Design a protein around this nucleic acid. Structure first.
Length: 437
RNA sequence: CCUUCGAAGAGUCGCUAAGUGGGUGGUCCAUCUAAAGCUAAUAGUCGAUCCUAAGAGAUGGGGAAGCUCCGUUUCAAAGGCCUGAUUUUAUGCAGGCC
């Protein structure tokens, strides 16, 4: 099960060697060879099990063999349920086409409408997108060539139907071509709707592959980051993993904490694969330090034994988060204590904690022990252009990931005070972010 | 190449507007972007000269596409003269008459 075993192109091998992957795992060892044959796959691998390369490499190989050009339109369409996971997949795909001549693009909710439209206008050979914006771009943009679709990939069909995109998926299937298209579906679990969607999107008979309490802290939106900094500074000697909603917020927090003399490591989907591997390998043997990473980037990774796991931002998949508080304790034999920051408006999440029957513990913090570095942070943001831009980007990404959360009954953006949210990023007045509120 | 953004001519279009608007065509579609602009291929002494007469006619103002016309003191800032120890926070004109 090695990459050199399979007959592939030269740029593909160059990119794979650059990312550092040599020994492919089982999921990408029992699916890629059938995929180069041109059949259809209904997989069941969990997210982060290496299936990303498994469904990517055939797409790049097909585009290379067919020798696509920008004026040929799109040839590969990947459909993902969440905004942040599509960014990770797009970041992975940017490195498999470093030397190839094809074109890659991203279409997700909350992004620039006209910029995405123009990127489609120029001709994008591989599009990674969310179901909601795909319908808009298909039914509204003129000049988006998609009649030359050669393959289609669905990721986390269970998540897509759970969020409520089944009508959108049906309309998308009714729009996209069907004859030359050889399709692909992946889903960790499978309910009736999963094969209901699989039947109308796959050729008949496709091959299928089979693979301790929790704490919380109630904090105000203008004091979340400052309290987090206080806690991290007070607990530097321990091992802490901090989860954030987006990659831009992860990088901004890491850079800021390193600028204020607090050493932290960072993981996000906009970094190199080798950089991510190096940092995660470093974190697993240092027995000290703080790692800040996104929720999705820490899904496939096997979390080591750490002293604290903080969920600073709302979880991407609360259904998985409720189970993980017991799953990681089943795996890790150490007392890895969990913490979750909740604002007063989104305090209803505790219901899902109570209903799912998990023990619940509340933590207090004195108001006058907070770091009192707000003035320094605001003075630094007004002075350093680079830090100002990174803070604005993190604010943008946090709002964009908060707006499109599946749990609309809990995480509603209309009840979020944007002034206080931007206060925690060092902004007196909120920067303007184009979000439907 | 990547990323974040991304205005558009009103007494005008048609009494009097609009912004995924608007203009013009085709048996829903096609095509442009007005209400802004540039761009080659014998006398001091006798008369006049001075004065005003009926009237004509500038200025102020108004009409008319204009050559020009009306109106003659009119809702014009329409000009002369005089006085003074040199003018009281220190030598930058004050007052009066018609």
């Amino acid at each position: 099960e090695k990459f050199e075993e399979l007959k592939l192109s030269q740029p593909t091998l160059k990119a794979i060697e650059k990312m550092g992957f040599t020994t492919m795992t089982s999921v990408q060892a029992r699916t890629i060879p059938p995929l180069l044959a041109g059949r259809d796959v209904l997989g069941a691998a969990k997210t982060g099990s290496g299936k990303t390369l498994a469904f990517l490499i055939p797409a790049i190989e097909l585009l290379h063999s067919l020798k696509f050009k920008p004026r040929n339109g799109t040839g590969i369409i990947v459909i993902t349920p969440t905004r942040e996971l599509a960014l990770q997949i797009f970041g992975v795909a940017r490195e498999l086409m470093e030397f190839h001549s094809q074109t890659f693009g991203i279409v997700i909710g909350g992004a620039n409408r006209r910029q995405e439209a123009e990127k489609l206008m120029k001709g994008v050979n591989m599009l990674i997108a969310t179901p909601g914006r795909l319908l808009d771009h298909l039914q509204n943009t003129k000049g988006f060539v998609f009649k030359n679709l050669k393959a289609l990939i669905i990721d986390e069909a269970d998540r897509i139907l759970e969020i409520g995109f089944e009508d959108e998926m049906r309309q998308i299937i009714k729009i996209l071509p069907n004859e030359d298209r050889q399709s692909m579906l992946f889903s960790a679990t499978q309910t009736t709707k999963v094969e209901d969607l699989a039947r109308i999107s796959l050729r008949p008979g496709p091959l299928f592959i089979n693979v301790l309490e929790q704490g919380y802290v109630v904090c105000d939106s203008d004091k979340r980051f400052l309290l987090l900094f206080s806690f991290l500074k007070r607990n530097q000697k321990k091992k802490i993993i901090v989860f954030l909603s987006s990659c831009n917020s992860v990088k901004y927090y890491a850079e800021l904490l390193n600028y204020i003399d607090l050493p932290v490591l960072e993981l996000h989907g906009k970094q190199k694969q080798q950089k991510r591997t190096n940092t995660f390998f470093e974190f697993c043997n240092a027995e000290r330090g703080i790692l800040i990473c996104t929720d999705v980037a820490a899904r496939g990774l096997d979390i080591p034994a750490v002293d604290w796991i903080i969920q600073f931002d709302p979880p991407d998949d609360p259904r998985d988060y409720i189970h993980r508080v017991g799953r990681t304790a089943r795996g890790t034999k150490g007392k890895g204590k969990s913490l979750m920051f909740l604002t007063p408006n989104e305090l209803g999440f505790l219901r899902y904690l109570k209903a799912s029957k998990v023990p619940l513990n509340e933590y207090e913090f004195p108001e006058n022990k907070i770091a009192n570095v707000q003035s320094q942070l605001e003075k630094l943001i007004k002075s350093n252009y680079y830090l100002h831009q990174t803070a604005k980007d993190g604010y943008r990404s946090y709002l964009q990931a908060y707006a499109s959360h599946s749990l609309k009954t809990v995480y509603q953006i209309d009840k979020l005070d944007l002034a206080k949210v931007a206060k925690s990023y060092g902004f007196p007045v909120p920067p303007k972010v184009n979000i439907t509120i």
